Amino acid sequence: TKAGSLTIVGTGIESIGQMTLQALSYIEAAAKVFYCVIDPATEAFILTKNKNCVDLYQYYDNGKSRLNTYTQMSELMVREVRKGLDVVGVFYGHPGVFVNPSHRALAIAKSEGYRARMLPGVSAEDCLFADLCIDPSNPGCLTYEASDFLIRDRPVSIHSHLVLFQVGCVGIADFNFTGFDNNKFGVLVDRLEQEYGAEHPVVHYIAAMMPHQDPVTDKYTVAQLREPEIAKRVGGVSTFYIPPKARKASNLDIIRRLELLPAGQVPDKKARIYPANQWEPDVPEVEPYRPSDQAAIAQLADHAPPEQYQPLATSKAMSDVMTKLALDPKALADYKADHRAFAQSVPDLTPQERAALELGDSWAIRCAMKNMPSSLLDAARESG
Amino acid sequence: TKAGSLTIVGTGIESIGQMTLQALSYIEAAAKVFYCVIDPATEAFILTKNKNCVDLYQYYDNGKSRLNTYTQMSELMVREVRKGLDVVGVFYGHPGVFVNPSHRALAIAKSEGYRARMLPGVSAEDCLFADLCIDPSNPGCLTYEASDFLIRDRPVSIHSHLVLFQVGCVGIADFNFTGFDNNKFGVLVDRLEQEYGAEHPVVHYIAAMMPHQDPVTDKYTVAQLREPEIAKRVGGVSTFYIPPKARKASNLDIIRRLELLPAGQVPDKKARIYPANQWEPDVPEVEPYRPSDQAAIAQLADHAPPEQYQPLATSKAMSDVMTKLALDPKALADYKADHRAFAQSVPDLTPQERAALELGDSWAIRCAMKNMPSSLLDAARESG
């Protein structure tokens, strides 16, 4: 009901390409855009998409408290919300991952009764998983800010991934346009030596920011981080990845309670699903084509879709409107305001499609768009 | 040099809108697309973008080992790579976050000497940070697979965020088209009770998959997860978020070594930057407009861009080509093959812009596109 909204979106890390379709659509629809990005091609791209943009980067200054900058960035966005405008804030990466002013501005907007949403984006950690070919699932992931990691003595797990952000500004409160010497970097290295040992690998990660660039994926020992020529290479966009030191054994009580029995056919804790993490020290070679893999591949020749598989069975008119709801924030707002009026004005919908949109029920839309076999519904645990 | 490539991309979580621009451009450019998505509007959207798509979901079956499915999904993609095709695999969310077959297929392709890349996407955890209004930086984030969390007794930190994926299939090796009862869910709840207590909050999180839907952000006590009507609500797309129980004190040795002195003006460990995590039990009210905030806002009236601020100063021809390199994989491949030939064929570039593209140097492109003031370069720590 109340005039004015704040939507905060990300650009991702790599110039232009890592922006989501919805982030782009909200930037184009905004009355006013406030942005804080790293690369100028992304900045130029945003300025082609909206005629009313403000660069938040101008609110940093030499020796100026970053907290004061963040208060100012937030207040510029919320001032325009209070004037009844649809405001979009744009931060590089994911706009809520290691970002102060987005959370501040959204919480203020929400507290004063305005519509307030953050749209997720591709973070530097998302890029790290993609470029280092690791999965946070295997074997778990601990993510910290480097200064916080030290000051609050945050725990490490030698059995899980460790990711550290802001390793180029250890202990630094303010800002300098020409960056920081990072003179307290050795305090971080001392902690990594205590937790992992002088010979343990640390990966210096910098995601490519322009589309033609390669990422930096430079493995050093903890000891090598002490060499001035290497310490020197860590900057404002440097992240560290520290791989696990060991594999963790299975808990017999849980093996019993989850019925993963007999215990004997539970794989050795050293056993790995292909592929192995290439960054782990002394990682054993893992066979990609075990006899069981070869047997599974042999089954492809005779494969047919299972009877319970649900093939897509939609229409141009239905895919068109579902695309429009995802890519047109004005169409979405109209639909959310009156499902029935919106649904009855879409051309070329079948009766089922019209009915599914009128309801808005995620399950109604799903069998408007997918053939649910009788085989599935005789079993199906949707009580209907 | 070798014919054939594998690019694995994500769709993000929310239908269509959370796909990145580069993921879309690679899907359109592919010779063959293999996809595994959740919602049918995203499936229909992909099929409008490429004429040669295969649904990987048909390779699941009732009582069929998920490992065998994953081997088959991988092998379908790598078979087309080996035939010299540009193959794109598409997985929902981030295609490397809790995904077996992407890592498998990329490692096989890489090992056999083919071009192999994963493009990051928006994960369910990215959505969680956006929808629950939390930042993994504050106060650190531990992310685990629910079965792994139990079987390997992965550590919790009561002072950091905990995120658990695959809480709807605790201990389950196979597949069923109608989903799982999740009968071992109580083993997870027993662990959460041991680590956090019966009264500690757990957030049941389900990101909206269609653009009009609201996320599920349902707070329960650990105790309430024992009630059958609540346990019942946890499914294949359920994630849990467990907020911290306590704030961690500062380490005096690090306060001294980072020179955050005098120790006395270091804030109390209970002190919080606005806003506070709303999910933490007994979270104190935090003032958004402290006197220091009000003073920072008062400075906005007299603000001018600092002398070292670098305004964008580019051209339509340069923003056009940098956009084309991000959004046209064929243009990017051409440019990477011969910087000079590509650069000399771009119309309307200024000499500086042409020179910057010929080099490809990220810094050369940056001062082709930004006015670097003399103030910046008298200080600037780019040795040049």
Binding site: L67, Y70, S147, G179, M209, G236 | D135
Partner: peptide, 14 residues
């Protein structure tokens, strides 16, 4: 040597 730090921890920033 891009420097776009949009976060600081309690204890450091102020």
């Amino acid at each position: 040597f891009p420097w776009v730090i949009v976060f600081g921890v309690i204890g450091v920033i102020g």
